[PDB]
Design a protein around this ligand. Structure first.
Ligand SMILES: [K+]
Ligand SMILES: [K+]
Ligand SMILES: [K+]
Ligand SMILES: [K+]
Ligand SMILES: [K+]
Ligand SMILES: [K+]
Ligand SMILES: [K+]
Ligand SMILES: [K+]
Ligand SMILES: [K+]
Ligand SMILES: [Mg+2]
Ligand SMILES: [Mg+2]
Ligand SMILES: [Mg+2]
Ligand SMILES: [Mg+2]
Ligand SMILES: [Mg+2]
Ligand SMILES: [Mg+2]
Ligand SMILES: [Mg+2]
Ligand SMILES: [Mg+2]
Ligand SMILES: [Mg+2]
Ligand SMILES: [Mg+2]
Ligand SMILES: [Mg+2]
Ligand SMILES: [Mg+2]
Ligand SMILES: [Mg+2]
Ligand SMILES: [Mg+2]
Ligand SMILES: [Mg+2]
Ligand SMILES: [Mg+2]
Ligand SMILES: [Mg+2]
Lengths: 121, 205, 78, 129, 80, 155, 70
RNA sequence: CCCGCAGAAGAAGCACCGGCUAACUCCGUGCCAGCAGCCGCGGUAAUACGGAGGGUGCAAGCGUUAAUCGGAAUUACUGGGCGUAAAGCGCACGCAGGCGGUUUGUUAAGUCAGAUGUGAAAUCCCCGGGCUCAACCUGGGAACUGCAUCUGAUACUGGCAAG
RNA sequence: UAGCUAGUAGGUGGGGUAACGGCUCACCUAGGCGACGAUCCCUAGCUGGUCUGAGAGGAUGACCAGCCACACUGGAACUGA
């Protein structure tokens, strides 16, 4: 670009979009589970990974991951979601927060306890 | 807010005496100084350039008994002051009251000296100062209070200090139990083993 | 005193002209010198100015909705 | 068309040095001569001469030290598409003082060093390293 | 009217006052015309507790500025 | 002579049977008083590669006119996709450089320098760019000699 | 330390794309099942009408893993 | 704030240890359960999952999420590109616009120089002072890169006149 | 979003205001604004500053201080410096 071209039309900023639109720049949001089910991952990996569909307070309807071994969630369970992609599950951009509202901590966990909502033994 | 764990562990990880024991006994007699602190201690894995900088930083911290937030703040000051950031950082740490009390010889270790300061047994220019971090300035007079000149540990420490080499930038009278911080130390008068450029590089990253 | 020198670009009003003042200003970002134009509605009592004349003007009290400048003298007739 | 004669002079020196020419020639002008004087006094060229009356020609004698050319770099700064002016204190240093910037001041064309000693800003014609 | 009074700065339990000329209707710590000195009520032994510019105070008094009771007392102290 | 290993990489050639692996080693060597050279070496296993590189580095030394442990002036260097910038710095700044530039600058004996690498940071090209930088760097004495002046006139 | 998986028997009704199968179990429920990693590593082909062992989970009674083909 | 009393007495957790990235072993599980920022890990000897022992990093906090700038020379004024990687309009003419060979005079708009006024205080920065230190508070300076006016300079750009 | 404007742009004279002024009215003239982006739509209180950055930039305007606007929603005046 010449000087004269930039004077006529300046350099434009490329606009970056969020990976976590449904949060609307909140650190967490609350929602009611409408479905709780399992899903198989993409090619290299193999599993039955645990997920829920949740309707947030702001009207968005998203899929969230349920981390750790075993969970107590059902349809109509009130949970708190945070941001975080699960790489091998298409279109899962949110994690459930274990040990907040109706989501229990993981049974018998001893390491990384704060990440799974588990009180000190 | 202080390290209250096993001391020689620290010496062994860094692989040098950090002067964390009195020096009544040689360190080899008390621990395996050559070998690193645990199950996989004997194997000597090769260290990254990040690793070399980290260990240098942690060596100096563990000598002077300073946690990371406070050490970070010392670096910012040394960087701000005119002159060499590296040379300034060491001078700041040498200024600390707990250090000065040790280097004068009223405590056996820096941790002992730190207990004297904290427990209200030291004065600077006449007045009680119970803050380990307090920066001592040129022509200050550090002294023990009348109530704690009797203490048995202070007398003992003065004997141990005679066996150690005497700092030039201080001047003590052990009968009076007081001494004078004459000047700030130079880089010459401190130990050549420390490689402070590594610390400057670490924080400049 | 405190005057601007300009150029008449209209005279189709009773006792009033439009004058265009031309400035040469460095661009804030890109550093090139650019031409910029201020257009003022000026008062001219004796309709003594035509399109193309170089006039000299001074700021005064409000004379109408859009006029706060008045003619000092003509510098060059067209 | 030709819209920058000074850039043309600098390009003739640059291309001439790279081709190991003894001398380069061009249509003269009073500004080109002013610049040629600064280059001669700072020791970047050997000599110059103008010859002709109606269509005068400036000829510069280029320099080589131990094979390699003396003018390592020569760059037009101010140009028709973008003019550059600097105040006294903002005058540029080229190669941390080892090179020159040629400056058009109200007391004539001179080096950036000479312009600082006079306390003059001006237009930055070119860098010569 | 215009008044010469104390604006309260410093920290909790350690007041430091700026002496300011202001339109009386403005907030204590708000818009002022000129600062004409300071008063440190908990100043130490060797430290200057009070400094006033008596000339600039005289100027403003000439133009019909009022003095607050506390600033009046400070002027007396400086005028031993 | 100080000596540093910058990178080791495993490379592969396909043949009738399968893949023949091999090792590459990039190294630099320097006196620490403005002499430096780099070497690149290939062999079937790492230690032989490193040895080959170090032998090459010692025979391909160039000179760099330093100014009391920093550069004479700001410098640019280019090779392939690699563009490097380096400028002089104050005492106690250290080597504010990244990747391969550090290793070249250390062993050359440049204690104080600010640097930045643009474009490709591929080590072989970054090293070549850096040394081309340093070798194309004039001292006051050189510039004065070209222009037919003394150092006092230049500075 | 993991929760127990109930194994049922069933017939392959339909082959879906990429080692996925509709399987009618003995209880009468149809589930979408995928081949195990052991069976795909050891090249055990599954076809329509085959009888299979299906590992199920209580979290989702519509999905399963085929772990054996008789 | 000071003095006395009693007795080590009332007071340590959180994340991490495959590479990036400081820190490794055993047992359980067997592409399952699970991990994951990216690359990836798990199909029987898993330093990558879960527990344990050991270790590393921070510490009255430690992690996770959200959000901004950085690294990103990845909108490039400083500081990038367009034969084949994304990118030369199918080709021309041409109004507005940008740019303009060479000499002299004149002007002084751009430009340059000096001065004057102004640019609130706080904030940032420097040298000091005060709270046992620090944070914090505070004296003075510097800075506020700007804007306006006046007086000058005339090389360069512009205007005007003649070539 | 490419055309917008009729008290609209200017004039003369009454009235009006603490005060200049289409501020208002009667008449007269036919103007005024716009690719140096008018008009229209969306978003938004502005600044000293703040965060980030080597810098040039980018993001931001909570606390403190300056300025502006609003007081359940839409109108209106009265009293008074
Ligand atoms: K896998
Ligand atoms: K410093
Ligand atoms: K550019
Ligand atoms: K045209
Ligand atoms: K001129
Ligand atoms: K109107
Ligand atoms: K009227
Ligand atoms: K701003
Ligand atoms: K309203
Ligand atoms: Mg703390
Ligand atoms: Mg490691
Ligand atoms: Mg195993
Ligand atoms: Mg950028
Ligand atoms: Mg590119
Ligand atoms: Mg193609
Ligand atoms: Mg293409
Ligand atoms: Mg074409
Ligand atoms: Mg011309
Ligand atoms: Mg001028
Ligand atoms: Mg100020
Ligand atoms: Mg009227
Ligand atoms: Mg009237
Ligand atoms: Mg008006
Ligand atoms: Mg709003
Ligand atoms: Mg940057
Ligand atoms: Mg009234």
């Amino acid at each position: 670009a010449t000087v004269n071209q930039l004077v006529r039309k300046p350099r434009a900023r490329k606009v970056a979009k969020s990976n976590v639109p449904a949060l609307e720049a909140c650190p967490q949001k609350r929602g009611v589970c409408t479905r709780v089910y399992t899903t198989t991952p993409k090619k290299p990996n193999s599993a039955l990974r645990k997920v829920c569909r949740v309707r947030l307070t702001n009207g968005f309807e998203v899929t969230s991951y349920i981390g750790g071994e075993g969970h107590n969630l059902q349809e109509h369970s009130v949970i708190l979601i945070r941001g975080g992609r699960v790489k091998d599950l298409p279109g899962v951009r949110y994690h459930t927060v274990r040990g907040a509202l109706d989501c229990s901590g993981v049974k018998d966990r001893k390491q990384a306890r704060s990440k799974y909502g588990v009180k000190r033994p | 807010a202080r390290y209250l764990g096993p001391k020689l562990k620290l010496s062994r990880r860094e692989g040098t005496d950090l002067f964390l024991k009195s020096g009544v006994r040689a360190i080899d007699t008390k621990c395996k100084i050559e070998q690193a602190p645990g199950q996989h201690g004997a194997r000597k894995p090769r260290l990254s350039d990040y690793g070399v900088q980290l260990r240098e930083k942690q060596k100096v911290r563990r000598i002077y008994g300073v946690l990371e937030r406070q050490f970070r703040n010392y670096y910012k000051e040394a960087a701000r002051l005119k002159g060499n950031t590296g040379e300034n950082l060491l001078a700041l740490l040498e200024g600390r009251l707990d250090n000065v009390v040790y280097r004068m010889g009223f405590g056996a270790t820096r941790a002992e000296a730190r207990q004297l300061v904290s427990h209200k047994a030291i004065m600077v220019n006449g007045r009680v100062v119970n803050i380990a971090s307090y920066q001592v300035s040129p022509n200050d007079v550090v002294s023990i209070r009348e109530k704690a000149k009797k203490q048995s540990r202070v007398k003992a420490a003065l004997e141990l200090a005679e066996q150690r080499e005497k700092p030039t930038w201080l001047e003590v009278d052990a009968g009076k139990m007081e001494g004078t911080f004459k000047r700030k130390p130079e880089r010459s008068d401190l130990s050549a083993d420390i490689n402070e450029h590594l610390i400057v590089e670490l924080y400049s990253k | 005193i405190r005057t601007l020198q300009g150029r008449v670009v209209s005279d189709k009003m009773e006792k009033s002209i439009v004058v265009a003042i031309e400035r040469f200003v460095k661009h804030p970002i890109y550093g090139k010198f650019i031409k910029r134009t201020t257009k003022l509605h000026v008062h001219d009592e004796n309709n003594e100015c035509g399109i193309g004349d170089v006039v000299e003007i001074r700021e005064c009290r409000p004379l109408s909705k859009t006029k706060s400048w008045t003619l000092v003298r003509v510098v060059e007739k067209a | 068309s030709m819209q920058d004669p000074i850039a043309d002079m600098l390009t003739r020196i640059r291309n001439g040095q790279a081709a190991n020419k003894a001398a380069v020639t061009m249509p003269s002008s009073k500004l080109k001569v002013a610049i040629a004087n600064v280059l001669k006094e700072e020791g970047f060229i050997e000599d110059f001469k103008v010859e002709g009356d109606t269509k005068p020609e400036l000829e510069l004698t280029l320099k080589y030290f131990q094979g390699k050319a003396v003018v390592e770099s020569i760059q037009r700064v101010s140009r028709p598409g973008l003019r550059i002016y600097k105040r006294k204190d903002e005058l540029p240093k080229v190669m941390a003082g080892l090179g020159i910037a040629v400056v058009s001041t109200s007391k004539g064309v001179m080096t950036d060093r000479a312009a600082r000693q006079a306390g003059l800003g001006g237009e930055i014609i070119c860098y010569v390293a | 009217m215009v008044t010469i009074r104390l604006a309260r700065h410093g920290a909790k339990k350690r007041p430091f006052y700026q002496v300011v000329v202001a339109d009386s209707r403005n907030a204590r710590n708000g818009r002022f015309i000129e600062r004409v000195g300071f008063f440190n009520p908990i100043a130490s032994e060797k430290e200057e507790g009070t400094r006033l510019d008596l000339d600039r105070i005289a100027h403003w008094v000439g133009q019909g500025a009022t003095i607050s009771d506390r600033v009046a007392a400070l002027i007396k102290e400086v005028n031993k | 002579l100080q000596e540093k290993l910058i990178a080791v990489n495993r490379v592969s050639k396909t043949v009738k049977g399968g893949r023949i692996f091999s090792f590459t080693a990039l190294t630099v060597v320097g006196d620490g008083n403005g002499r430096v050279g780099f070497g690149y070496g290939k062999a079937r296993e790492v230690p032989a590669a490193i040895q080959k590189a170090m032998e090459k580095a010692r025979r391909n030394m160039i000179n760099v006119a330093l100014n009391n442990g920093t550069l004479q002036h700001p410098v640019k260097g280019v090779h392939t996709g690699s563009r490097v910038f380096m400028q002089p710095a104050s005492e106690g700044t250290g080597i504010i450089a990244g990747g391969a530039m550090r290793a070249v600058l250390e062993v050359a004996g440049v204690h104080n320098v600010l640097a930045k690498a643009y474009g490709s940071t591929n080590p072989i090209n970054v090293v070549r760019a850096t040394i081309d930088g340093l070798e194309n760097m004039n001292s006051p004495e050189m510039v004065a000699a070209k222009r037919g002046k003394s150092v006092e006139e230049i500075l | 330390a993991k929760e127990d998986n109930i194994e049922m028997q069933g017939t392959v009704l339909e082959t879906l794309p990429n080692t996925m199968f509709r399987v009618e179990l003995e209880n009468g429920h149809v589930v979408t099942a995928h081949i195990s990693g052991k069976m795909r590593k050891n090249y055990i082909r599954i076809l329509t009408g085959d009888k299979v062992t299906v590992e199920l989970t209580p979290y989702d009674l519509s999905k399963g893993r085929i772990v054996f083909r008789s």
